[PDB]
C-alpha cells in the first residue's frame, strides 16, 4: 500500500492503520497451513 | 464408543497333538472324475454320498 | 439407467389381437 | 502400442484366457463380517450384499436355461449376471454405480485397495501401538541431558 | 449511563459517544420475532414506514396458498398462524429432557367451486420450537444456537479475465437465483457471445434470442453497435424462431424429437415461471439496482423476464465494448464495471429465521405434494380439511433441522463471553455455502468492506480461518440480510448528531472520516484536512469540505471479545487474535473478581450475555436467599427469581449464581441482583488480578513457561469446580431383562458398602476411579465351564451365578463427590427410547486446584504452561516483604510484538495503589488532556481504558510517577515501573531493578485431563486388529509415516519392527510378548502382521494370483 | 516364515480359483433371523469357511480339542479354531 504505517506499536497504531495491518496478519495466518504442504510434498518425493 | 462381537466366542485351552482322536479317511469321486478325501472319526457310519469341494 | 436395451428389444414384436391368443 | 500388450501375453507362458471367468472367488467371511452392535442392531459390510446379487442372478439363470426360455429372456439374464459381476469387482466402472440402501455407492472389492482408505494407502500411514502414551511438557532445568 | 448498578469504573476516554451500544443479541431475537410475526416486530415495522408487513411464516403460508388441483374444480388456502402458550418451562424442559416448544395452529379455507361450498377449522400443525429469552433453543434437553450463515446473494455478477493466449479481456456473467436452474453468458476469444443453460454445452446467444422470438431486425436495431454479436449472428445457421427450439430441445431429450408447443413452453417453465425459478425477493432487488430496471416500487415478481435477460446480455456486450455508463429504455442510467463477489454489497446473511423458514418451506412442499396427490382419490363434497392435511413431513423437517443441521450447534457454555460470542457468530460454511477444504485464500482474506460489519481480528486460528467470524459491536442486520453500520452525518464541515445506518454498497458513494478527528466546541472540524476512507477501500487525506459521513466511535470495527483487550493498539493483530480467542476458553473460578484495568465493555457484555439476573421492575428487595430472590414492585406486584445452583454446563464447567442484594434494598428496573459464573457486581470477571514480575528466573520460565507462587494453591485463587455426568441404561435382551441391583456377583462387601437399596451410589459419597456408581447385571445363559474352573468351583462350591456383572464404574483417572442422581423408569410412563427400561444419571463434582501443566494465559495473547509452583518464601519479594505471585520471562515479550501487556502491567500497579497528581501550580502539561475525574483515586481503584480511546503513552509515565506511598509511607515502584526485588533463596537483593505490576491472567479450559493417555494393553478394533484410541480409555498413539522415516534414518530396524508388528497388529505375538514380560522371559521374535495376510487374501479374492516363493 | 525371497503377481485362471476354495456358495442367504446362526449353504456357511466357535461343531456334536481336524460326519463342519474364518475362501461357479 502506498501509505506507510507511521506509528510504532509503542505509540499505538490508529484505527485505520491497525485495520490495514489485519490484511497481512490474516494472509500470513491463513497461508502457513498451505505453505507447509509444499515442503511436505517435496520431502515425500525426495524420500521416495 | 460402541462395541460388538462376532457370531462366536473364544476358547483359551492349550493342548496339542498329544491328544489324538481316532480318525480314518473316506474317499469320494464326483461326476466329472475329480476325487476327494474326507477325514472322519472312527465312529464312522460314513455316508454313501458327500458334497465335495 | 441401462434397462432401455430390454425395452427396445421387446418393442420389436407387436401385441396380439384377441383371436391370435387362442390360435397360439 | 499394440505390440507391448501382445508381447506381454506372448511372454511368461501364461495363457490369455484368464480374462474370462468361469468361476469367481469369495472373500472369507470375517473380512466382510456381520456384527451385532450393543442393543442388538446389526452392522454389515457392503461386500456381502454385492456377492448376494451375483448369487441371485446366477441361480435364476441356471433355472431359466433349464426350462428353455426364449433367447430374449436368457440373453437379458446373462447381461444382468455380467453387470452384477462387474459391479462386484469395480463398482462405477460401468457408469453410474449401484447404491443399495440410502443414496451412497456400495464399496466394491477394488474400492478396498484404490482410494485413500485401503491396504495400499492406509497401511503405509503406520499403525496405533500399545505401550505408548501422550502428555503435555514443562521445562525441567535441573535435568541432565540424558 | 443507563445501567443503574454499574460499579464506579473511572474511564480514560476523551471522546463523547453519540450512540449507545445496541442489544448484542438482537441479531437472533429480532430475526426469530420476524419469523413468528410477533406484535412487537409488527409495530416496529409500521414505525419504520412500512405498510401491511407480513411475518416469515405468513409469507410461507401465502406462498403455499392457493393449493389448486388442475381443471380448477376445488382449492385450499392456509392462513392465520397462531401460537399457544409453551407446553413447559425452560427449567423443566432442561430437567426432564424435553424440547421447549409451543403448539402451532392455522386456519384452512377449503373451497369447492363445482358446488360453491366453503369450509374451515383450526388445524394443529405441531409443536414449534421456540427461542427462549436470551436467544437459545432447548432441544432434547440440550441447549443449542443457530449460527447465522454468510452466503453470496442471488443476482447478476459480471466478471472479466485477461487471457495470455491473445492478451484479450474476455467477459462473462452469471445469474444465480435463490431457487431454480442457473443461467450464464460469456464472450469467447473468437469474438463471439455464448450461452450456457444449467451448465450445459456452450451454445450461441442468438439461439436463446430467437427462442424468445427475436429476429434479425431487432438484434440489428438494439445491438448493431457491437461487432461480436453481429459476427455470432452471421456464423449462426438458425433461421426462424422455431429453429432455435429445434436445436435446444434435443439437447435435454436426446431420443425424443421436439414438438412446437412443449419446446416453446419449456423455456418459460424453466426460467420465467415463479413455480420453478425464484429470486427470493433479494435477487430481484439486486438486479433492479444493478441493471436499473423497475426501480421505485416493491416488485412482487421474483421470476426471470424477457426484458431483464436481454438487459443483462446488453450490459455484458457494452462492458466488453468499453462503455463506462449505460442506460436502459424505461430505466435509469447506471455505471459499467465488473462485480466483486467478496463485497458485502453482494454477500448476505441468512439469520436463524430464514434458516428455519427454508426447512418449513420444504416440509410444507412435501405436505403439498401429498395433499394434491390424495385429493384426487376421496369423496367430493364430503371431505374435510382436517382429514387430509398431513402434518408429519413438516414436523419431521423441523426435527431434522434442529438435530442434524450443521448450523444448529451445541451452545458453548464455557463462560458467559463464549456463549455471547457464539450467538452472534457468522459462518461461511455449511449447506448452501462453502466447505473447509475448498475456496482457497480469496474467500477468507480481509476486505475493506468488513470495517464496522465483521471483525477482522477475532476468528478461529485453525483451518477455519476467515470462514468464521464475529459481528461487529455496532452492526445490525438489514431486513434483506445485508449488514448495516451507523455513521454520523456531517454538513459542510460541521458534524450533526443524526445517525444513519448504511449498507455496504451505499457506503462506497461517500467518504467517511475517522471518529477521533478533533472538532470545535460547536462541532466544526478544527483541522484543514482529515483522514478518510474512499470508495475503493483506500485510506487518504481529504479536505474537510468534502467529508459527508463520520464514524460513530473508534470501537466500531472491533467485536465484543476484541473490545475487551486493553491497549489493543500496542498488540499486533497476530497476537490480538490469540488474546481474543483465549478469553473464550477461560473457566469460571470459585470466586471471580473484576479486573483492575479493563474496558467499558466488561459491563455490557456481562448483562447482555443473559447469565446474570436483572430486576424486571423497580421495587424493593423483600427476601433474599442463596436459592431465590423475592422483590416487591412499586406497582404492587411481587416477582420471584430462582437462582440455578451448581448446574453443569455443556463443557462441564460449574454455572453457580449468587445474590448481591440485601433485604430492604431498593433496585431500579434492569439492575443486576445476582452474578453469573464469571461476573462480579455485574461486570464480567474471566480471570484474576495478581502481582507479576518480568524477569528470567533460574530457567524455570524458559520457553514461555510460567512460575506460580504456592499462595495461589493455598488460598484457592485459581481453583475451579468441575462437574461430570455418567449415564447407564438398563434395557432388555433375548435372555431376559437386565436389572439394577445392589448385590452383584463376586464383589467384596466393602465395595458395595456405599450403595443404596436400589443399587445406586449414595449421594454425597466420595468416589474414586474403579468404584461402583450403579450396580447392574445381565443374564448370562450358557456357561459350559472349563474343567479347571469346574474343579475350582467344586473346591469352594460357589454357585455359578445366572447373571454377569456389567456395573457402571468411575472411569480411569476420575474422582469427586456425588452431587446428584436423576432416574427414569418406564414403569412411571417416561419417554425412554424403544426397548429401554431404566436410565440412571450420576453427577460427580470435583474441586480442581492449579497444578503443574495447567495452561495460563493473558488478554494479550501470551500463554504458557505452569512449569513450577514454588513456596512463598522462595518467591522474589518487594522491599516491604510482599512476594510476587507470578514471574514471566523477558525474552518472550519484545519479539512477539505484544508490548501491550507491559502497559497493562504498569496501569495495574497504578490502579492497585492510588495516585494523586500534584496539582499545586496548575495541572502538569502531560496531564492537561486528562479528565478532572482522573486527577486522584484511592487504592484498589478500578480504571477503564477503551481499546481505541484509552490512556496515552505520556500519561502512563506521569501516573507511575504520582503513585501514592504504600502502607509504611514509601514508594515500592519508581517512575520507570521497576522495583528492587529481593532474592528469596539467597537473600541477596537482585543487582538491577525489575519491572513489577499487576496483571489480569486467565485459567484456560485446555486441561490435558482428556489429553493425557497411557496404554499397556486395552481394547482392539473388530475390523482392523490394531488398537483404537482418541475416543475411549487406554487409547493407542499413532506411529506415523515420518516417524518410520526417522526410524529408518537412525538405522533402527528392531525397534521399528516391534512397533509395527508386535505392539500393533501381530495378534498371535501380542499375548506371547505379554506372557514373556509377565514371566520375566526374553521377548520372542515377531510374526507376520495381520495387515499383510489380509492384503494377500484381498488380492486373491480379486482374481489375482499372488504368492510368496524362494 | 520370513525367508521370503520375492513376491509375484500374475493372472489367475479358473483352475486356481477353484483350487483356493473349500466349497462353493450355492445360496444367497447369510444368517437366520431367529437363531442367528449361519445358514446351511449361505455366504456365512461354517461348512465352507470354518466353525464359528473354537474347536466346536455347528451342531455341537464335537466340542473338544481332542477332535482337532475332525470333519463332522453329520454336517461336515471342521473342528478348528474360529480364526480360520479369516483365511478360508469360497467360489461361485456361474452358468
Ligand atoms: Zn456337526
Residue E1048 · residue E1042 · CB < 8 Å: no
Contacting residues of B for F37, CB less than 8 Å apart: 7
User: SS3 for E436?
Assistant: coil
CA dist E52 and F12 (Å) reads 78
Q: Does F89 touch chain D (CB under 8 A)?
A: yes
Closest-CA distance of chain D to residue B21, Å: 28
CB-based contact B2 D34, cutoff 8 Å: no
H or E element: which one contains E360?
helix E352-374
Contact list in D for residue C5 (CB cut-off 8 A) is 79
Going by beta carbons, is chain C in contact with chain D, meaning 3 or more pairs sit under 8 Å apart? yes
Which region holds residue E398: left if phi is over 0, alpha if psi is between -120 and 50, else beta? alpha
Q: Please tell me whether residue E151 adopts helix, strand or coil conformation.
A: strand
Buried b (16+ CB within 10 A) or exposed e, E934-943: beebeeebbb
Indicate the pairing of strand E408-410 with strand E347-350: unpaired
Distance (Å) from the alpha carbon of A10 to chain E's nearest alpha carbon:
6
The b/e string for D76-110 (b: 16+ C-beta within 10 A; e otherwise) is bbbebbebbbebbbebbeeeebbeeeeeebbbbbb
Contact A3, E540 (CB under 8 A): yes
Q: Which residues of C touch D94 (CB under 8 A)?
A: 2
- Which among F11, F30, F85 is the nearest to D48, CB-wise? F30
DSSP, residue by residue, chain B = ---EE-SS--------TTS---EEEEEEE-TTS-EEEEEEETT----S-----
Whether F12 sits inside 8 A of E1100 (CB atoms) is yes
Smallest Cβ–Cβ distance between D139 and the set E700, E1028, E1070 belongs to E700
CB neighbour class for E944 (10 Å; exposed up to 12, middle 13-18, buried from 19):
buried
For residue E183, give the nearest of E160, E206, E157 by alpha carbon. E157
All three cell numbers of D37 = 452392535
Grid coordinates of E1098: 484381498
Gap from CA of F72 to ligand 1 centroid (Å): 4
Output the CA F46–ligand 1 centroid distance in Å: 10
What part of E 20-49 touches B (C-beta under 8 Å)? Answer: none
Which residues are E174's β-sheet partners? E157, E184
Residues 6+ apart with CB under 8 A from E145: E135, E136, E137, E408, E409, E410, E411, E412, E419, E422, E423
**B-chain residues within 8 Å CB-CB of E1025?**
none
The chains in contact with chain E, meaning 3 or more Cβ pairs closer than 8 Å, are A, B, D, F
Q: How was this structure determined?
A: cryo-EM
Other Cβ atoms within 10 Å of E211 Cβ, number: 23
Quick one: DSSP state of residue C15? P
CA distance E456 to chain A (A): 6
Partner residue facing E1106 (CB), from F1, F7, F63: F7
Min Cα–Cα distance to chain B from D145, Å? 41
Query: Mutation test of the interface with chain B: which of F30, F71, F72, F85, choosing the one with the most B Cβ atoms within 10 A?
Result: F71
Distance from CA of B7 to the nearest CA of D (A): 7
Q: Which chains touch A (3 or more CB pairs under 8 A)?
A: E
Cβ separation E1100–F89 shorter than 8 A: yes
**Alpha-carbon E868 to chain mean position:** 35
Inter-chain contact D141–E700, Cβ cutoff 8 Å? yes
Partners of residue E441 in chain A, C-beta under 8 Å: 27, 30-31, 34
Helices (H) and strands (E) in chain A, counts: 1, 0
Q: Which residues contact B33 (CB under 8 A, 6 or more apart)?
A: none
What residues of chain F lie within 8 A of the CB of D51, using their CB? 25, 43, 92
Report which DSSP code applies to E773.
E
F6 in contact with B at a CB cutoff of 8 Å?
no
Q: Do F and E share at least 3 CB pairs under 8 Å?
A: yes
E917 neighbors E571 (Cβ within 8 angstroms):
no
List residues forming the annotated binding site of F for Zn(2+). Answer: 57, 59, 72, 75
State whether E1103 and F17 contact (CB < 8 Å).
yes
| Helix/strand/coil (H/E/C) assignment for every residue in E74-128 | EEEEEEEEEECCCCCCHHHHHHHCCCCEEEEEEEEEEEECCCCEEECCEEEEEEE
d(CA E609, CA E25): 8
3-state secondary structure of E444: helix
Whether chain C lies against chain A with 3 or more Cβ pairs closer than 8 A is no
Q: What phi and psi values does residue E1049 have, to the nearest 5 degrees?
A: -65, -40
- Contact between chains at F54 and B10 (C-beta distance less than 8 A): yes
Measured in degrees and rounded to the nearest 5, phi and psi for residue F26 equal -100, -15
Is some CB atom of chain B closer than 8 A to the CB atom of D34?
Answer: yes
D13 interaction partners in chain F (CB closer than 8 Å): none
Residue E762 CA to residue E819 CA, distance in Å, equals 10
| Torsion sign across C-alpha atoms E830, E832, E835, E837 | negative
DSSP secondary structure letters along E403-427:
HH-SSEEEP--SSHHHHHHHHTEEE
E355 φψ region: left (φ > 0), alpha (ψ -120 to 50), beta (else): alpha
- Are E1041 and D124 within 8 A, CB to CB? yes
Per the annotation, binding residues of F are: 57, 59, 72, 75
Q: Which of B52, B9, B10 lies closest to B34, judged by CA?
A: B52
Question: Do E768 and E733 form a contact (C-beta atoms < 8 A)?
Answer: no
Distance from CA of E1088 to the nearest CA of F (A): 8
Comparing C-alpha atoms, which of E810, E808, E617 is closest to residue E724? Answer: E810
Nearest Cα residue in chain D from C6: D76
Distances (CA, A) of E1038 to D126, D127, D132: 7, 6, 9
H-helix segments, D15-95: 47-66, 71-89
User: At how many Å resolution was this determined?
Assistant: 3.4
Q: In E820-965, which ranges are continuous DSSP H helix?
A: 892-896, 900-912, 953-961
Facing B39 at nearest CB: one of F53, F62, F69: F69
Residue E1091 is inside which H or E element, if any? helix E1090-1101
Q: Scanning every residue of chain E, which has its alpha carbon at the shortest distance from the alpha carbon of D131?
A: E1016
Measured CA to CA, the distance from residue E20 to residue E1080 in angstroms comes to: 76
- Name the phi and psi angles at F62, rounded to 5: -115, 115
As for chain F, the residues directly before each break of C–N over 2.5 Å are: none
Chain D residues close to B4, C-beta within 8 Å: 35-38, 43
Chains C and B touching, counted as 3 or more CB pairs less than 8 Å apart? no
Half-sphere exposure of E573 (CA within 13 A, CB side): 24
Distance CA A35, CA A40 (A): 9
DSSP E1062: I
C-alpha atoms less than 13 angstroms from C-alpha of D81 in its C-beta half-sphere:
23
Cα(E347) to centroid of ligand 1, in Å? 71
Amino acid at each position: 500500500i502506498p501509505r506507510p504505517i507511521k506509528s510504532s506499536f509503542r505509540e499505538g497504531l490508529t484505527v485505520l492503520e491497525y485495520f490495514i495491518n489485519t490484511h497481512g496478519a490474516r494472509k500470513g495466518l491463513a497461508d502457513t497451513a498451505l505453505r507447509t504442504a509444499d515442503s511436505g510434498y517435496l520431502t515425500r518425493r525426495l524420500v521416495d | 464408543v460402541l462395541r460388538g462381537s462376532r457370531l462366536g466366542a473364544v476358547s483359551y485351552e492349550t493342548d496339542r497333538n498329544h491328544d489324538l482322536a481316532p480318525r480314518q479317511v473316506a474317499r469320494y469321486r464326483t461326476d466329472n472324475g475329480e476325487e476327494f478325501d474326507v477325514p472322519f472319526a472312527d465312529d464312522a457310519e460314513i455316508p454313501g454320498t458327500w458334497l465335495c469341494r | 439407467d441401462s434397462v432401455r436395451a430390454y425395452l427396445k428389444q421387446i418393442g420389436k414384436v407387436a401385441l396380439l389381437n384377441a383371436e391370435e391368443e387362442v390360435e397360439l | 502400442k499394440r505390440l507391448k500388450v501382445v508381447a506381454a501375453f506372448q511372454q511368461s507362458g501364461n495363457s490369455p484366457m484368464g480374462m474370462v471367468l468361469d468361476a469367481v472367488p469369495v472373500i472369507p467371511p470375517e473380512l466382510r463380517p456381520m456384527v451385532q452392535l450393543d442393543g442388538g442392531r446389526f452392522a454389515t459390510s457392503d461386500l456381502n450384499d454385492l456377492y448376494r446379487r451375483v448369487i441371485n442372478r446366477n441361480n435364476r439363470l441356471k433355472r431359466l436355461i433349464d426350462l428353455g426360455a426364449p433367447e430374449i429372456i436368457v440373453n437379458n439374464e446373462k447381461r444382468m449376471l455380467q453387470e452384477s459381476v462387474d459391479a462386484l469387482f469395480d463398482n462405477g466402472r460401468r457408469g453410474r454405480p449401484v447404491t443399495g440402501p440410502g443414496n451412497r455407492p456400495l464399496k466394491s472389492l477394488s474400492d478396498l485397495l484404490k482410494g485413500k482408505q485401503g491396504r495400499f494407502r492406509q497401511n503405509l500411514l503406520g499403525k496405533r501401538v500399545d505401550y505408548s502414551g501422550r502428555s503435555v511438557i514443562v521445562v525441567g532445568p535441573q535435568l541432565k541431558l540424558h | 449511563n443507563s445501567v443503574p448498578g454499574a460499579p464506579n469504573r473511572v474511564s480514560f476516554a476523551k471522546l463523547r459517544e453519540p450512540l449507545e451500544v445496541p442489544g448484542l443479541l438482537d441479531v437472533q431475537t429480532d430475526s426469530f420475532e420476524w419469523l413468528v410475526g410477533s406484535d412487537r416486530w409488527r409495530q416496529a415495522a409500521i414505525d419504520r414506514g412500512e405498510e401491511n408487513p407480513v411475518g416469515g411464516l405468513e409469507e410461507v403460508l401465502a406462498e403455499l396458498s392457493p393449493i389448486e388441483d388442475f381443471s380448477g374444480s376445488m382449492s385450499l388456502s392456509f392462513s392465520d398462524p397462531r401460537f399457544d402458550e409453551v407446553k413447559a418451562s425452560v427449567d423443566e424442559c432442561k430437567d426432564k429432557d424435553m424440547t421447549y416448544a409451543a403448539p402451532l395452529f392455522v386456519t384452512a379455507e377449503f373451497i369447492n367451486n363445482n358446488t360453491g361450498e366453503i369450509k374451515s377449522q383450526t388445524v394443529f400443525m405441531g409443536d414449534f420450537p421456540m427461542m427462549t429469552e436470551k436467544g437459545t433453543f432447548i432441544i432434547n434437553g440440550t441447549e443449542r444456537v443457530v449460527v447465522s450463515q454468510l452466503v453470496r446473494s442471488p443476482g447478476v455478477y459480471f466478471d472479466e479475465t485477461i487471457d495470455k493466449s491473445t492478451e484479450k479481456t474476455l467477459h462473462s456473467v452469471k445469474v444465480i437465483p435463490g431457487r431454480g436452474a442457473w443461467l450464464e453468458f460469456d464472450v469467447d476469444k473468437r469474438d463471439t457471445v455464448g450461452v450456457r443453460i444449467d451448465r450445459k454445452r456452450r451454445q450461441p446467444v442468438t439461439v436463446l434470442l430467437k427462442a424468445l422470438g427475436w429476429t434479425n431486425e431487432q438484434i440489428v436495431e438494439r445491438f448493431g453497435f457491437s461487432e461480436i454479436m453481429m459476427g455470432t449472428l452471421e456464423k449462426d445457421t438458425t433461421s426462424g424462431t422455431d429453429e432455435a427450439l429445434l436445436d435446444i430441445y434435443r439437447k435435454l431429450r436426446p431420443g425424443e424429437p421436439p414438438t412446437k408447443e412443449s419446446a416453446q413452453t419449456l423455456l418459460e417453465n424453466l426460467f420465467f415461471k415463479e413455480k420453478r425459478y425464484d429470486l427470493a425477493r433479494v435477487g430481484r432487488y439486486k438486479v433492479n439496482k444493478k441493471l436499473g430496471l423497475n426501480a421505485g416500487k416493491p416488485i412482487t415478481s421474483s421470476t426471470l423476464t424477457e426484458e431483464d435477460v436481454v438487459a443483462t446480455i446488453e450490459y455484458l456486450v457494452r462492458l466488453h465494448e468499453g462503455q463506462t455508463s449505460m442506460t436502459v429504455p424505461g430505466g435509469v442510467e447506471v455505471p459499467v464495471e465488473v462485480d466483486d463477489i467478496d463485497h458485502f454489497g453482494n454477500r448476505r446473511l441468512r439469520t436463524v429465521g430464514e434458516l428455519i423458514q427454508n426447512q418449513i418451506r420444504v416440509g410444507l412442499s412435501r405436505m403439498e405434494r401429498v395433499v394434491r396427490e390424495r385429493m384426487t382419490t376421496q369423496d367430493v363434497e364430503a371431505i374435510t380439511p382436517q382429514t387430509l392435511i398431513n402434518i408429519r413431513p413438516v414436523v419431521a423437517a423441523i426435527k431434522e433441522f434442529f438435530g442434524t443441521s450443521q448450523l444448529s450447534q451445541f451452545m458453548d457454555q464455557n463462560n458467559p463471553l463464549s456463549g455471547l460470542t457464539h450467538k452472534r457468530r457468522l459462518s461461511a460454511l455449511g449447506p448452501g455455502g462453502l466447505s473447509r477444504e475448498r475456496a482457497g485464500l480469496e474467500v477468507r482474506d480481509v476486505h475493506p468492506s468488513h470495517y464496522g460489519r465483521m471483525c477482522p481480528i477475532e476468528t478461529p486460528e485453525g483451518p477455519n480461518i476467515g470462514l468464521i467470524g464475529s459481528l461487529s459491536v455496532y452492526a445490525r442486520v438489514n431486513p434483506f440480510g445485508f449488514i448495516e453500520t451507523p455513521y454520523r452525518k456531517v454538513e459542510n464541515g460541521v458534524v450533526t448528531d443524526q445517525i444513519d445506518y448504511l449498507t455496504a454498497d451505499e457506503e462506497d458513494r461517500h467518504v467517511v472520516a475517522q471518529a477521533n478527528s478533533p472538532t470545535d466546541e460547536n462541532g466544526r472540524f478544527t483541522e484543514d484536512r482529515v483522514m478518510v476512507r474512499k470508495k475503493g477501500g483506500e485510506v487518504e487525506f481529504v479536505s474537510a469540505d468534502q467529508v459527508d459521513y463520520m464514524d460513530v466511535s473508534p470501537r466500531q470495527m472491533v467485536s465484543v471479545a476484541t473490545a475487551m483487550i486493553p491497549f489493543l493498539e500496542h498488540d499486533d493483530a497476530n497476537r490480538a487474535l490469540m488474546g481474543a480467542n483465549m478469553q473464550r476458553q477461560a473457566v469460571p473460578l470459585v470466586r471471580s473478581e473484576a479486573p483492575l484495568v479493563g474496558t467499558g465493555m466488561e459491563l455490557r457484555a456481562a448483562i447482555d450475555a443473559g447469565d446474570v439476573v436483572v430486576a424486571d421492575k423497580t421495587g424493593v428487595i423483600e427476601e433474599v436467599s442463596a436459592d431465590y430472590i423475592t422483590v416487591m414492585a412499586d406497582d404492587g406486584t411481587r416477582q420471584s427469581y430462582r437462582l440455578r445452583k451448581f448446574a453443569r454446563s455443556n463443557h462441564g464447567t460449574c454455572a453457580n449464581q449468587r445474590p448481591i442484594v440485601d433485604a430492604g434494598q431498593r433496585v431500579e428496573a434492569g439492575q443486576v441482583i445476582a452474578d453469573g459464573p464469571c461476573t462480579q457486581n455485574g461486570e464480567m470477571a474471566l480471570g484474576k488480578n495478581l502481582l507479576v514480575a518480568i524477569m528470567p528466573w533460574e530457567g524455570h520460565n524458559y520457553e514461555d513457561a510460567i512460575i506460580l507462587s504456592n499462595r495461589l494453591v493455598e488460598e484457592d485463587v485459581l481453583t475451579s469446580i468441575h462437574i461430570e455426568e455418567h449415564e447407564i441404561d438398563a434395557r432388555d435382551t433375548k435372555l431376559g431383562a437386565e436389572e439394577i441391583t445392589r448385590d452383584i456377583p463376586n464383589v467384596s462387601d466393602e465395595v458395595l458398602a456405599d450403595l443404596d437399596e436400589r443399587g445406586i451410589v449414595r449421594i454425597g459419597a466420595e468416589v474414586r476411579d474403579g468404584d461402583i456408581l450403579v450396580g447392574k447385571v445381565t443374564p448370562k445363559g450358557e456357561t459350559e465351564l472349563t474343567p479347571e474352573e469346574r474343579l475350582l468351583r467344586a473346591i469352594f462350591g460357589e454357585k455359578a451365578r445366572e447373571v454377569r456383572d456389567t456395573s457402571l464404574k468411575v472411569p480411569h483417572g476420575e474422582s469427586g463427590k456425588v452431587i446428584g442422581i436423576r432416574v427414569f423408569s418406564r414403569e412411571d410412563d417416561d419417554e425412554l427410547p424403544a426397548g429401554v427400561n431404566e436410565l440412571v444419571r450420576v453427577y460427580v463434582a470435583q474441586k480442581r486446584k492449579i497444578s503443574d501443566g495447567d495452561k495460563l494465559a493473558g488478554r494479550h495473547g501470551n500463554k504458557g504452561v505452569i512449569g513450577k509452583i514454588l513456596p512463598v518464601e522462595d518467591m522474589p519479594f518487594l522491599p516491604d516483604g510482599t512476594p510476587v505471585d507470578i514471574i514471566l520471562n523477558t525474552h518472550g515479550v519484545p519479539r512477539r510484538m505484544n508490548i501491550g501487556q507491559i502497559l497493562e502491567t504498569h496501569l495495574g500497579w497504578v490502579a492497585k495503589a492510588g495516585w494523586n497528581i500534584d496539582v499545586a501550580a496548575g495541572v502538569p502539561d502531560w496531564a492537561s488532556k486528562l479528565p478532572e475525574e482522573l486527577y486522584s483515586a484511592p487504592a484498589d481503584s478500578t480504571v477503564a481504558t477503551p481499546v481505541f480511546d484509552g490512556a496515552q503513552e505520556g500519561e502512563l509515565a506521569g501516573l507511575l510517577g504520582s503513585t501514592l506511598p504504600n502502607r509504611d509511607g514509601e514508594v515500592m515502584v519508581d517512575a520507570d515501573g521497576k522495583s528492587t526485588l529481593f532474592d528469596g533463596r539467597s537473600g541477596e537483593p537482585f543487582p538491577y531493578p525489575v519491572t513489577v505490576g499487576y496483571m489480569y491472567i486467565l485459567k484456560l479450559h485446555h486441561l490435558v485431563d482428556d489429553k493425557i493417555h497411557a496404554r499397556s494393553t486395552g481394547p482392539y478394533s473388530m475390523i482392523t486388529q490394531q488398537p483404537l484410541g482418541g475416543k475411549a480409555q487406554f487409547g493407542g498413539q499413532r506411529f506415523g509415516e515420518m516417524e518410520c522415516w526417522a526410524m529408518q534414518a537412525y538405522g533402527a530396524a528392531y525397534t521399528l519392527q516391534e512397533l509395527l508388528t508386535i505392539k500393533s497388529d501381530d495378534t498371535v505375538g501380542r499375548v506371547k510378548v505379554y506372557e514373556a514380560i509377565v514371566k520375566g522371559e526374553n521377548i520372542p521374535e515377531p510374526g507376520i502382521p495381520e495387515s499383510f495376510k489380509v492384503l494377500l487374501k484381498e488380492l486373491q479374492s480379486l482374481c489375482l494370483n499372488v504368492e510368496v516363493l524362494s | 516364515v520370513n525367508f521370503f525371497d520375492e513376491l509375484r503377481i500374475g493372472l489367475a485362471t479358473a483352475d486356481d480359483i477353484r483350487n483356493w476354495s473349500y466349497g462353493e456358495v450355492k445360496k444367497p442367504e447369510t444368517i437366520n433371523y431367529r437363531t442367528l446362526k449361519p445358514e446351511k449353504d449361505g455366504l456365512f456357511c461354517e461348512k465352507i469357511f470354518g466353525p464359528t466357535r473354537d474347536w466346536e461343531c455347528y451342531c455341537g456334536k464335537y466340542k473338544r480339542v481332542r477332535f482337532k481336524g475332525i470333519i463332522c460326519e453329520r454336517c461336515g463342519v471342521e473342528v478348528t479354531r474360529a480364526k480360520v474364518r479369516r483365511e478360508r475362501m469360497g467360489h461361485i461357479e456361474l452358468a
